[PDB]
Amino acid sequence: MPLHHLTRFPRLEFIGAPTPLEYLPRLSDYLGREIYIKRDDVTPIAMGGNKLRKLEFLVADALREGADTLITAGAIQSNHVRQTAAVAAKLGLHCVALLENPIGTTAENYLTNGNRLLLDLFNTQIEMCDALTDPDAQLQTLATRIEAQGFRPYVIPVGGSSALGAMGYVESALEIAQQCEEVVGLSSVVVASGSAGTHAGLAVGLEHLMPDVELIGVTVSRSVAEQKPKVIALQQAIAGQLALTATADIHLWDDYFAPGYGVPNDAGMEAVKLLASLEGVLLDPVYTGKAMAGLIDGISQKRFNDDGPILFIHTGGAPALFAYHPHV
Amino acid sequence: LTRFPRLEFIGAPTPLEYLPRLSDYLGREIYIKRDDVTPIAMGGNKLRKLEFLVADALREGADTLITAGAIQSNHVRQTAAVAAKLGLHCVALLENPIGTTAENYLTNGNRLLLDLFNTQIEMCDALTDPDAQLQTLATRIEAQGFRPYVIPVGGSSALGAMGYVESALEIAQQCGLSSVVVASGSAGTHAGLAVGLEHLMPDVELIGVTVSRSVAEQKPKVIALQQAIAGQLALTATADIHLWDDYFAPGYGVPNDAGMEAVKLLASLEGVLLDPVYTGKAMAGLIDGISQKRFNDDGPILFIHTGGAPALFAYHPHV
Ligand SMILES: Cc1ncc(COP(=O)(O)O)c(CN)c1O
Ligand SMILES: Cc1ncc(COP(=O)(O)O)c(CN)c1O
């Protein structure tokens, strides 16, 4: 009942059935704690991920406005851009992507393989910049240029993380509550926290459907001081759009991303190896390997509220494995 | 069918989807069976087979899965993922079928994943007699203390092929269809669908586009397997096997221009990722079947996407 104003928003159907929520018995045996995984890495468009859920809402909005072109921004290996570009190709929309190299690599697989390879299969128009210093302004300037050609552009913010885009994670939280019903009593949920739509939308859903579950965001690009106001602002804007209040505190751990967005680290790589080798699950060096390194150290240090089951939200990212290989 | 032990790797039936943009472009209704979206380690058709073969492996108390393929085999990758998930060791007998020294083919895409899954790698100069060579390796590995179970190439035995009989049931539930198109390689996909569709959808024409062999070399292989699957299901199987072999030159594992064009077509019109070895070749055959009015009629076509996209990253920029 409490999430019913979610109905009001038009949304396209990109996902179909709920993604699997799976027990991880071998990882659980190794870590000493019950671990489940929400498989949003298996959403069925072009190698999947979390952004498909936000795109259901943002793209329906674009179509309702008569937009014929999606414009967005991200790193060269952005999964968000790749999902946007894929959904543009499927709907016959034009797509322009503003990309940066956030790590200064000159490695050939980073520059041309992985997600960046897929952009060319989707016929994305690619524009480089030096840095996404002000992505909102930079996307605007691009949109004016593109409007000047007669296109009708719809700007998707970095990660698709607006209140509307985040409604896809509010819906995720409904799936998750239904799938856990009479199957597992979760104590904790772990998700990577980047542009913040996933964390914020899960925060609102979970507050209203599973108030006693502890949600933990593991930052992938910023400290708690810099990330938390972003997540809170979205959380409140999402609640507002749904006529709800959201009084939960947002929780963030920032110890697992150094030395910076897009830079692999040892604990990240060891988490990827652990999940591949124990569960046949593929994480990624930028986002999910770092969030899973967080979950693991949190168990080790007793950082969670209790000893109860933890659900990891697998937000996707695997095609970056092939871009990061052999090194950047 | 419900008689054979099987593990649950897939779950809900995979989507069967209309492709409206590609249908618009080609002037014909095209649908696709998304077996590329199976949920383990980037997906594919082989998981369906592994549900039966691995259930059998555990029944024998095996602790090791052994299989063979090219360095970029999807089948080996999916086998190795299922091993990891189940806590079985995995041994992969690999060959370089194309003589390349390109770094991405040698170490990226499916091969990178084998390393993530702690797969034990054995190189061989050629899979001249895969069944015999797997047999020999199984005996060495046993001699080191393991209990191996051998999975044949493509996991394409009668048992393994039952997973494709299952796919046909899903296809029948999900479906005014005239044709179905599928890559035809190690032949379990083709033969299992052949048996399933003969019974469930007898008016539909099943076309296998070969990826490694001529019609002459492939047809007996598919027929034998068709008959062996039908025997074990206590079914009859009298349908002809239809193969087009024009779409794979110059050989298995070698991309060709029509295949790369089909990959680009599906990506740009529908956001769908094919692959250079299997499904881009099979799609190229589908497209040229339209070009050459080569199907029985002008009616709907279902393409079976059997997977393979991770090889995109191995084959780039070239081999
Ligand atoms: C795999 C993956 N996981 C998580 C994230 C971070 O999600 P969010 O931007 O909603 O914080 C992203 C960002 N595109 C992602 O690609
Ligand atoms: C993506 C892909 N397509 C189709 C095939 C061919 O299927 P089969 O080997 O059962 O003929 C394979 C074989 N491993 C494959 O990996």
UniProtKB/Swiss-Prot annotation, chain A:
Family: Belongs to the ACC deaminase/D-cysteine desulfhydrase family.
Taxonomic lineage: Bacteria, Pseudomonadati, Pseudomonadota, Gammaproteobacteria, Enterobacterales
Role, per record: Catalyzes the alpha,beta-elimination reaction of D-cysteine and of several D-cysteine derivatives. It could be a defense mechanism against D-cysteine.
NCBIfam families linked to this entry: ACC_deam_rel, PRK03910.1-1, PRK03910.1-3, PRK03910.1-5
InterPro entries registered for this protein in UniProt: ACCD_DCysDesulf, D-Cys_desShydrase, D_Cys_desulphydr_bac, TrpB-like_PALP, TrpB-like_PALP_sf
Record keyword Metal-binding present: no
The protein's enzyme class: lyase
Origin: domain of life: Bacteria
EC number per UniProt: 4.4.1.15
Catalyses which reaction(s): D-cysteine + H2O = hydrogen sulfide + pyruvate + NH4(+) + H(+)
The protein's assembly and partners: Homodimer.
Cofactor annotation: pyridoxal 5'-phosphate
Keywords: Lyase, Pyridoxal phosphate
Name of the encoding gene: dcyD
Molecular functions (GO terms): D-cysteine desulfhydrase activity
Protein name per Swiss-Prot or TrEMBL: D-cysteine desulfhydrase
GO biological process, one term: D-amino acid metabolic process
Alphabetized SUPFAM superfamilies for the sequence: Tryptophan synthase beta subunit-like PLP-dependent enzymes
Modified residues (N6-(pyridoxal phosphate)lysine): K51
